[PDB]
Design a binder for these strands. Structure first.
Ligand SMILES: [Mn+2]
Ligand SMILES: [Mn+2]
Ligand SMILES: [Mn+2]
Length: 192
DNA sequence: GCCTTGCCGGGTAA
DNA sequence: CGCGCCGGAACTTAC
DNA sequence: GTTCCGGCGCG
DNA sequence: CCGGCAAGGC
């Protein structure tokens, strides 16, 4: 479980990108702790994401179930679990200390969430500049050059652009790495 | 003249 | 009574 | 993506 | 996120 640290970082990438970590207060004084990943495709959630999360749940001995909730515009993968909530939230605080394998898992997960998925250009969008700057250093250390600029003035959304000059390096070494789960498209490219 | 990458508006998938 | 899992979905907006 | 709702479980 | 347009570089 060099392997659940990997699956974890991958899942954290999807969570940070397309989901969230929610601590809720209710009447009264009831509460709830949620780990959420949302996504349009129901089979992507059920076939590629949910089984990774389930593996993690079993390893951590989390007794919560994986819920799949249908919304009008997206499916929601949801785990209601205080333990899993803090497991991911602490990991998120220690993100700058990720070892190399975790960095790749995380970047891969973040790319599935927010990346340019035509792969004609290699781009990641986010309003969290500090998060993108952490990914920028990780990429540079991996020999993948990149820039960051404000790409949407209306919403404060930055873009991280990966130089097409390191396209093969990025796609083969980060996205297609077999040290942790392969994202779709990348796995499909390998099998053709 | 062929790429690469910043800029930007549309609107879906968060 | 005081909190923490379910199951749904109305609501806002960041990709 | 975010936070409401009603519900149940358990010490 | 997508995809078009254009300034900039080679
Ligand atoms: Mn996001
Ligand atoms: Mn997103
Ligand atoms: Mn996405």
């Amino acid at each position: 479980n060099e392997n659940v640290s990997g699956i974890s970082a991958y899942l954290l990438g999807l969570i940070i990108g397309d989901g969230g970590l929610y601590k809720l207060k209710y009447k009264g004084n009831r509460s709830e702790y949620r780990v959420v990943i949302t996504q349009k495709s129901e089979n992507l959630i059920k076939q590629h994401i949910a089984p990774l999360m389930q593996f993690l749940i079993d390893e951590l001995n989390v007794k919560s179930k994986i819920q799949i909730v249908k919304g009008d515009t997206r499916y929601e993968l949801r785990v209601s679990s205080k333990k899993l909530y803090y497991y991911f939230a602490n990991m998120l605080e220690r993100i700058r200390l990720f070892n190399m394998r975790e960095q790749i898992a995380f970047i891969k997960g973040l790319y599935v969430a927010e990346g340019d998925k035509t792969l004609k250009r290699l781009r990641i969008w986010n309003k969290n500049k500090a998060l993108l700057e952490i990914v920028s250093r990780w990429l540079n250390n991996l020999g993948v050059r990149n820039t960051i600029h404000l790409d949407d003035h209306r919403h404060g959304v930055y873009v991280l652009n990966i130089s097409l000059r390191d396209r093969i390096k990025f796609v083969h070494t980060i996205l297609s790495s077999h040290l942790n789960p392969l994202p779709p498209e990348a796995a499909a490219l390998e099998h053709h």
